[PDB]
Each structure stands twice: as structure tokens, then as C-alpha cells.
Amino acid sequence: HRFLRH
């Protein structure tokens, strides 16, 4: 769906 973020 979408990219990862942290």
C-alpha cells in the first residue's frame, strides 16, 4: 500500500 516510516 504505502512505504514505511519511523
Task: Please characterize this protein's 3D structure.
The PDB classes it as metal binding protein. By secondary structure, this protein is mostly loops. It has no helices and no strands.
Query: Mind telling me the C-alpha Rg?
Result: 6 Å
Number of helix segments? 0
Gross morphology: rod-shaped
Helix content: under 10%
Structure described in brief:
The chain has 6 residues and is low in regular secondary structure. It contains no helices and no strands.
How are the elements arranged and paired?
Blueprint: no helix or strand
Features:
0% helix, little secondary structure, 6 residues
